Structure formats: structure tokens, C-alpha cells
Amino acid sequence: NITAQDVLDKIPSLDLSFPEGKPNCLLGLTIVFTGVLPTLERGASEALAKRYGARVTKSISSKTSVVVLGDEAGPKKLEKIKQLKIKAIDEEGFKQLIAGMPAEGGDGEAAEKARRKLEEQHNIATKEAELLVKKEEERSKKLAATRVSVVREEDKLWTVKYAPTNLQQVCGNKGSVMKLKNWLANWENSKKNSFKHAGKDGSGVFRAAMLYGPPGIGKTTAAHLVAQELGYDILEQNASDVRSKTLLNAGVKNALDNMSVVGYFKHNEEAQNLNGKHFVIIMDEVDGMSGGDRGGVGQLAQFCRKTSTPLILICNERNLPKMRPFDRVCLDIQFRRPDANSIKSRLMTIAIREKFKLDPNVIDRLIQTTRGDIRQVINLLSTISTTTKTINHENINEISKAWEKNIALKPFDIAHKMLDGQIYSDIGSRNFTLNDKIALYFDDFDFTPLMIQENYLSTRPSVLKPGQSHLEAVAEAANCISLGDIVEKKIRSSEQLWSLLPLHAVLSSVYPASKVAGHMAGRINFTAWLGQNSKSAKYYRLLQEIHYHTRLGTSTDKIGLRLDYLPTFRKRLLDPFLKQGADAISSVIEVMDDYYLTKEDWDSIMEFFVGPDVTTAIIKKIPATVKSGFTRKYNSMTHPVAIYRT
Amino acid sequence: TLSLQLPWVEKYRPQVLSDIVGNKETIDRLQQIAKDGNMPHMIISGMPGIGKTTSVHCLAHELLGRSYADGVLELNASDDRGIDVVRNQIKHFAQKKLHLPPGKHKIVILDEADSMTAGAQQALRRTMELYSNSTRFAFACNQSNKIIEPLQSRCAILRYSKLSDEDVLKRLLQIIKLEDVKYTNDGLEAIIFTAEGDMRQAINNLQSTVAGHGLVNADNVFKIVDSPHPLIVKKMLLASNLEDSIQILRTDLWKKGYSSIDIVTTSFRVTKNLAQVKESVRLEMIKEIGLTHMRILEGVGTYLQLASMLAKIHKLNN
DNA sequence: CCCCCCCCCCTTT
DNA sequence: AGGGGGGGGGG
DNA sequence: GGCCCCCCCGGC
DNA sequence: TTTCGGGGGGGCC
Numbered sequence A: 001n002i003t004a005q006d007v008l009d010k011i012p013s014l015d016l017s018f019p020e021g022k023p024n025c026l027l028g029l030t031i032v033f034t035g036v037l038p039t040l041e042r043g044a045s046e047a048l049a050k051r052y053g054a055r056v057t058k059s060i061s062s063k064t065s066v067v068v069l070g071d072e073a074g075p076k077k078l079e080k081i082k083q084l085k086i087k088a089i090d091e092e093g094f095k096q097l098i099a100g101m102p103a104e105g106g107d108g109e110a111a112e113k114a115r116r117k118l119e120e121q122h123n124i125a126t127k128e129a130e131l132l133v134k135k136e137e138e139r140s141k142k143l144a145a146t147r148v149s150v151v152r153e154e155d156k157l158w159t160v161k162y163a164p165t166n167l168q169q170v171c172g173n174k175g176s177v178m179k180l181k182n183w184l185a186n187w188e189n190s191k192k193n194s195f196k197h198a199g200k201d202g203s204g205v206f207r208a209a210m211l212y213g214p215p216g217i218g219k220t221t222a223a224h225l226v227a228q229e230l231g232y233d234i235l236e237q238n239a240s241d242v243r244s245k246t247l248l249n250a251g252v253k254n255a256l257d258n259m260s261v262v263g264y265f266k267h268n269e270e271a272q273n274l275n276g277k278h279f280v281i282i283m284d285e286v287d288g289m290s291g292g293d294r295g296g297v298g299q300l301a302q303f304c305r306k307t308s309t310p311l312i313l314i315c316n317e318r319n320l321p322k323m324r325p326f327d328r329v330c331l332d333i334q335f336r337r338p339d340a341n342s343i344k345s346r347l348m349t350i351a352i353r354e355k356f357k358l359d360p361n362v363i364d365r366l367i368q369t370t371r372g373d374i375r376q377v378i379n380l381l382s383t384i385s386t387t388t389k390t391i392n393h394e395n396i397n398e399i400s401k402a403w404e405k406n407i408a409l410k411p412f413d414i415a416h417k418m419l420d421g422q423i424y425s426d427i428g429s430r431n432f433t434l435n436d437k438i439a440l441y442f443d444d445f446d447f448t449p450l451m452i453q454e455n456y457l458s459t460r461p462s463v464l465k466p467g468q469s470h471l472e473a474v475a476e477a478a479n480c481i482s483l484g485d486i487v488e489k490k491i492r493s494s495e496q497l498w499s500l501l502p503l504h505a506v507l508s509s510v511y512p513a514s515k516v517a518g519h520m521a522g523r524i525n526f527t528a529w530l531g532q533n534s535k536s537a538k539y540y541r542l543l544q545e546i547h548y549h550t551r552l553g554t555s556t557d558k559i560g561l562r563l564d565y566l567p568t569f570r571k572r573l574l575d576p577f578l579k580q581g582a583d584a585i586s587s588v589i590e591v592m593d594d595y596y597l598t599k600e601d602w603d604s605i606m607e608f609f610v611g612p613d614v615t616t617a618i619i620k621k622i623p624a625t626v627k628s629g630f631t632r633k634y635n636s637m638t639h640p641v642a643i644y645r646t
Numbered sequence B: 001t002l003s004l005q006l007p008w009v010e011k012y013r014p015q016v017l018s019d020i021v022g023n024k025e026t027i028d029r030l031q032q033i034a035k036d037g038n039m040p041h042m043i044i045s046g047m048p049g050i051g052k053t054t055s056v057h058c059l060a061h062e063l064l065g066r067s068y069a070d071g072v073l074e075l076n077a078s079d080d081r082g083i084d085v086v087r088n089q090i091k092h093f094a095q096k097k098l099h100l101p102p103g104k105h106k107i108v109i110l111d112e113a114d115s116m117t118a119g120a121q122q123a124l125r126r127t128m129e130l131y132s133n134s135t136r137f138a139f140a141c142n143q144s145n146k147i148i149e150p151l152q153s154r155c156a157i158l159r160y161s162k163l164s165d166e167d168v169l170k171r172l173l174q175i176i177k178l179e180d181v182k183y184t185n186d187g188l189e190a191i192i193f194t195a196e197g198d199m200r201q202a203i204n205n206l207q208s209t210v211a212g213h214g215l216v217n218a219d220n221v222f223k224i225v226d227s228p229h230p231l232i233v234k235k236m237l238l239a240s241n242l243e244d245s246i247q248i249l250r251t252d253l254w255k256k257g258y259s260s261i262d263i264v265t266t267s268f269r270v271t272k273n274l275a276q277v278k279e280s281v282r283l284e285m286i287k288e289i290g291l292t293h294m295r296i297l298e299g300v301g302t303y304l305q306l307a308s309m310l311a312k313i314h315k316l317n318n
Numbered sequence C: 001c002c003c004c005c006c007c008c009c010c011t012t013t
Numbered sequence D: 001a002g003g004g005g006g007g008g009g010g011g
Numbered sequence E: 001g002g003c004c005c006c007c008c009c010g011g012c
Numbered sequence F: 001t002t003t004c005g006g007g008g009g010g011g012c013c
């Protein structure tokens, strides 16, 4: 009847309140939103697009159908649009488009394929609901039969009622679950080979597993289901148990190489169920091991390499320093946030069983509200369905705003957000306020100033005042950074003036960024001050050692020793080896004896010079025989000691 | 003379969910949950004097009836709530066996859960899951960010809003009707104005009036009550001329007994949230206020320093 | 087997 | 921001 | 039961 | 990283 391309052709094409349409009128058309729309905000425009089933893509691609363009569009957007020759429209164009598809279909293969996918999802949801009701019916029949000769199904949390029963019912992370199943299904072969026959997947060398991912993605569920499907008997320890070295070495340790009495007394009548007699250890919430569990992490790491039964560790965040001991002793399995297309049918099934209407078009939004948390979205559905019987586009905004998950940002994310020119503009400052910026700083107040100081010279600004240059803004930012450093020194003092922390937030992070806010010109780099400070401390300790090894013969301080004495000591200690060969040894030794210097002190002194006097290459170029003879001569004599019992 | 009267804040603390004003949607959800049952794990967040503890207590009471004394375990900041407590007492309570009506469960109330340490919150994780068929958890906090993400994932979020003037007026009028307190419209308006959405403060000021002077009018309220000094600081920092700002600072703050540190902190906070001034101007003002705050902290806290701060602020805002 | 979107996740003591 | 990785679509 | 020690925050 | 002071949680005894 009506093809989408014809309607698009009718609409005007740009060159380089709204009317109500019909259900799924934009279905099958991919729309990318760029720039600022005078009428609708980015969130409002995205909601209006998703109302009609349109798929919103964050990036422009050859498959894109239309791209609404307004004002303030980035150069990359225009470059991609021109390269891929993608049509663009205006606010009036979008208004006409949303009402120019009365047939909500009858278009190219894209719309038909989208409708087929929607029908397949509906059919899958219906089949799941049918199977669930059949299971309920058989359970009721068994209960009646038992009662003829305990927990009500309507009294359970929805997260327990609809918990996955098999590994095919788990949504998302299919690859990770498959990898875990393969690893646990070939554990016997690896054990028979002593965990040395590394397979193609590489999981044959690891006798332990480390599952990590964000909350509410199906990690504990996946581990338990994998253990159960293979017949293993599950032994579990959670954060509610004191997992310290003292009790860990007296508890679960014995089970690492012992059979299960439960398995033997429960699978005595079964056949081929070898795993029933074995153990599978599951350590849940390893990251939750606080001071109450002393030395537990090290003991778990030791067990990982000396365990005779499969061992699976579960944690939320794997990149903490505290989790370093598990660096290369377990097979790491990452569980990423499931996409909104993985749990869709599950949400239809829950809606059908619970007798409330959940429009599919608003499902995606909910996933962003909880940041891909299945437990949280199920809880949200259960709570909202209590009084609201319809979850549609007329109320999704309120629910999403009232259930937003506030996850503290990390150093890199904080730096990226705070060095963005949008938030510092009038409109951006109106939306993202100064209080929000101070809170973003407080999210990590120990690393935000360092990241800002590290990444405030590698951006192209977009907030430059009229007549100002990039260098002047950089200088102003540096001045405020110095002032913030002074304030920090005052905070960490003998007076503990922590009440000045908010002021520091404005002086160290917010103000300089506002002065150089723009677009990052390169990769965000981690602060380099910590490694440099550690190196400086090490070199200062070495300098102090040299100074107190030579104090008796020298008249100076450590600074004077470094700035003035050391070059002459180089001329007296390193130059001779380069001129007279091995014959220098004696002379050099004498000089060292004249100042109570050792070989370690020799290397430390040689490691101080910088610039044109770097001795690393020269020292490497010294003949090996000369150094060997020097060492032999040094170790073949008796030398004095400047300080006894250092 | 040695016998005390129960304050109105405790004498009229709502005992049924129908008497809690404000947050109509959440209260309706709680009422329907009580009518049906199957209470989930929940976290109630908000600001002081809004009815979070009242809501949780009313829900638990109406849910558990006569079994309140056996199915409710209440712990607050005045009780030890360390890792050992979570791992022993709460675990034993969750594992306890108790007979309750069909759709009722034991309730573990953790008031002011924000103060709880990370270890205890982590330990609660699997306990809330293994025994969810018999026990449910209700956290009440002021700052939701203090509760770890795994715990938030397991519960239902209930963020409370500040009571509007209409709801505060309704509850205040009910209290006046019950106590037969003579009042005037301006007095109630002043009480609401000082309340700032805090029902506890509103009731306390209403009792102080009547207890102090009798008939509730703006005159008596302002005689016993002081207009919030943040508004005075805002007026001082928004004056068109330096003379007016100095006059406000002297007459309304310095001569009233407010300390310099309080004044400078309030000025910082007010300048942070002045949406009618540009961000750059606010940042410069904050820099000046921080300089003055550091000077005051060093020990030099004088009227001259605050006057200099105002002069510099007016220099910037020109 | 090979390639192309679409997004996520990690840099980090 | 830049680079690596996982999964659906085309091929 | 009591010292003694180590680790971790600190604004609103 | 980091200059006191307070709190928790574990280890000797």
C-alpha cells in the first residue's frame, strides 16, 4: 500500500503539541538524534521516538534510515552523514514523519523482519507462560495427592518465583555461561592430565574459576545451575560466614579432598552419577571479605592452586588491588550487563502471569533505569504493579526518574564528564548544576584532583572567552590548581580542617575544568604523580643512605651532596674504568675506602645523574671482564664500616 | 512540677498508614501491600521530618498484628550493628521458626542504615536471599548513597519527597482541632514558612507557641522562632549595593549573635545554589568566600573580614 | 571461515 | 577519548 | 574479660 | 600518597 521510502521522499530533505500517530508507525526505521532540538530535549525526543517502536542508535551507520539534525552538531556527525549519504530532516520533518505512516507497515524487508521478530518474541513468551502454568498445575496435583493420604506460591518474591531453572533460561552472557559449563564438564579430563594439557579454549589449565560482573546479572544463579546440571554436590560459603585463615584452614580445607556423605547417601540408588559423590566449592562475594576475614584472600588464592575439587569464586568488581592475589590462578569469566533484547520475553511472561500490561516499547527504558540489573527491574515491576496496572508511555517517565540507580563514577569517567564543555554552558549548567559537579568530585575526592591536573592540558576547549587563547586558560587553571594544592595542604595538617573539603572541590577540580572545558584531544591518561612520587621517595632514601655512609669524610648536607659532590665522585669512580680498563679497579676501591662506600652505594650514586651525564648506557658498555674483576677485587678484601648495625 | 507531658510529636505520631501526609503514591502502595501482604525488601530514603520511621513502623504493625513483638527485629544507630551482630543475631532471627498468617513474614527494621559499615552490609547480602521466604528487610536512611549497590539491587527503592505546604497545613489543622488551640492564619503561615517541609519542626514550634504565648500568630511565632538565617544570607549576597549588604550583615546577623564561621559556611552553601547567577560569577564568589573561610579558621574571625568578603563579592559582581 | 554494526568495558595506587 | 571484546546480521 | 595492634573515613 | 582523632574488628594475653 504505502512504502516508507515514498513517504520519506515526500518529506523535505535538508542539505549540508506534536500530532498523535498510530501504534508502531515508526517500527523498522532506525533514527539517530544529533544536535539540539528547539522543542524536545534529548531525553524527550528519545522517548517520543521509542513510543512508536523506532530503534535509536547512538552512532550513525550505513544501515541508518533517517537522522534528525538540528543545531550544534559535532564535526564527526556531519562527516559520517556526508560519507554515508544518509538523509536528514528537521523538527517539522519529524512531525510529518510521525504522522505519515498510517499503515504502520507495508514497507521494505526491514519492517517485515522486525514484525517477524516481534511475533517470535510474543510466541516465546506465550510458550514460557504455558510451560509455567503447566508446572504449577502438576505441582498442585502432587500437593493434592500428598494431602489426600508448604510455602504459598503467591507469598514469594517475584525474583524467586521466576528465578531461572535451567541454563537455557538465563538471559545474556551466553558465552560466559557456555565457557563455565565447558570448563566444569571437562574438569575430570584436566585432573587426569594434571591440569597441564591446555585445550583450545585454554580452560584445561585452571582448576578454579573467578566470575566477575556488575550486580544482578545472574552470577550466583549461573554457578549453582552449572554445578547442579553436572551432578556435583554444592558446598557454598558466603560473606555471612567468617572466612578467615584460622577458620578457613580448619573448615572447608578438609572438603577439598574428601567425599560427600550427602552425595553417597543420596545417590546410592542412582547410576552414572559420579559427580554426585564429588564436591563443587562456591565462594560467593569474595569482594565482601572485610577486616572480619583476616588473610582469607591469600588462603583462597593458595587453595585455587592446591584444590582437588572444582572451585568457583564469585565477585562483583575484579579490578581492585585486594583481588590481585587471584591474578593468574583462576580462569576469569566476565558477566556483562545483559542487553534489553535478552530479557524481553521474560518480561512479557512475567506480565502475562501477573496480570498487568507492560508495553514492550517502554521495557528498554527500564533497563537503563536499573543499569542492566535484572533483580532490580523485577523488583521495580513487582512494586509498581502493586497499584499501577498499566506500564505505558504515559507514566514510564515518572517511574524511571523515581527509580534511577545512582552509581558512583570512577576516576576516568569522572575526568571525562568534568572535562566536557556541554555541562559548563548555560543550558548544561542549568541541567547539570554546580552542586552536581561538587558531588561528582566527592564521588572520589582522593583521585579527582590528580586526574584533573593530569588531563587539563590535553583537550580542545569549547568555553574560551572572547579574545582568550588556550594558553591563557591553561595558565588560569594552573593558578587555581596551585591554590587548591595549598588548601589541600591545610586540610591534611595538624588541625584536620576537613570542613574545607567542598572548597577544595571548587579549587582543584571544578574551576580549572570550567576554564579548559571542551573535547578531549586524546586518550584520558592515568595520573602520573603517584609513580613519580614513589620514585622520588626511593631516590631520597638512597641519597640519605649515601650521605650517612660518607658523613665522616664530607662537610655538607644531603642536598649539597647531590648537587655538588656527586659529579666529582663520578669523575673519581666511573671515569677511571672507561680509560685505563681493569687497572682502574684499585684506584676506585681506594676512593671508596676513603669514604666508606660499598658496591650498592656505587650503583646508587651512578643511578642519580640526569641529562648529559646519564651513565646507564656507558655502564652497560663497560666490558664484562672489567666489572667481574672489580667485583672480585672488592669481595677479596676487608672493608671498613661507617655505621654498625644499620 | 516533676511530671512531664508527652510532646505532640510523640502524642500524635501517626499510628496507621492513613494518617501519614505527603507522598501519596508511596503511602498508597504501602497500604495496598498491607492489605494484600508479601512485603518486599525495601529502602525508604528522604530528608528529616517526613515520616520514614513512622511509615516503616506503621507498615510493620499493621502487617504483623499481635505478632509484632515476635516477628519484628528493630535496630538503629543506638544499637551495636557490627559485622558480628549481623552474622549472629540477625542470622539467628532470620533462621528462627515462627507461625504467621498465610501472607505474612518476619520483619527486620534497620533504622538509619546509612551509618552501617560496608562489612555488615556485605554480610547481609546472602542472608536477605536465603531466608526471603520467611523474613523481609526494611531499611530507612537519609542518604541512599551510603547503602552499597548489592543491597540496593535486592530492595525496592522508595524515595520520599518533602512535604508540601498544603500537607503540613492539613496535619497542623488536625492537631489544632484535637488540642483546641486558638490560632490565626498568619501564625500558621509563619509556622509553615519556618518548617521548610519538616513536620517535626512545625509541630515543635506550634507547641512552643501556645506553650509560650498562647494564640498562634506571626508575632508570637517570630518572637520565639527565628527566620532561617540562610534566607538572610541570600538577601545579603543579592543586595544591589555594598551599603545594603553590609547593613544586612550587621543588623540581621552580627548583632543577632551568629558566629562568623556559621555566616561564612551559610554564604558558601547559598552561593552554591543560586540558579539566578551565572556559574562563573558563583565560582569567583566561592573562591573569595573560601579565602575568607580559611582566614576565619586560622583564628581571625571578625566583622571586618566579613565586610571585606562582601566588598570583594560586589567587586566581582560588577 | 570471513566481514560488518552496536554497544559495552577498561584504562587506574 | 582510544582500543579491545562480545553478539546479531550479512555474507 | 582486658590491652594491643592494624585498617579505614573525614562534605552535605 | 598524605601530617590527628575516632571507630571498628581482629590478635596476643
Ligand SMILES: Nc1ncnc2c1ncn2[C@@H]1O[C@H](COP(=O)(O)OP(=O)(O)OP(O)(O)=S)[C@@H](O)[C@H]1O
Pocket: A158, A159, A160, A162, A163, A164, A169, A170, A171, A172, A214, A215, A216, A217, A218, A219, A220, A221, A222, A315, A316, A338, A374, A375, A378, B125, B150, B153
Ligand atoms: N540473567 C538473569 N536471567 C534471569 N533472571 C536473572 C538473571 N540475573 C538475575 N536474575 C534474577 O535476579 C535474581 C538474582 O540473580 P543473581 O544470580 O543473584 O545475580 P548476581 O549477579 O549473583 O547478584 P550479586 O553479584 O550477589 S549483587 C535471579 O533469581 C533472578 O530472579
Ligand SMILES: Nc1ncnc2c1ncn2[C@@H]1O[C@H](COP(=O)(O)OP(=O)(O)OP(O)(O)=S)[C@@H](O)[C@H]1O
Pocket: B008, B009, B010, B012, B013, B014, B019, B020, B021, B022, B046, B047, B048, B049, B050, B051, B052, B053, B054, B055, B141, B142, B171, B199, B200, B203
Ligand atoms: N507524614 C507525616 N505525617 C504526620 N506527622 C509526621 C509526618 N512525618 C513526620 N511527622 C511527625 O514528625 C514526627 C517524626 O517523624 P519521623 O518519622 O521520625 O521522621 P523521619 O524522617 O523518620 O526522621 P529522620 O529521617 O530519622 S531525621 C512524627 O511522630 C510525626 O509526629
Ligand SMILES: [Mg+2]
Pocket: A219, A220, A221, A284, A314
Ligand atoms: Mg551473588
Ligand SMILES: [Mg+2]
Pocket: B052, B053, B054
Ligand atoms: Mg526517624
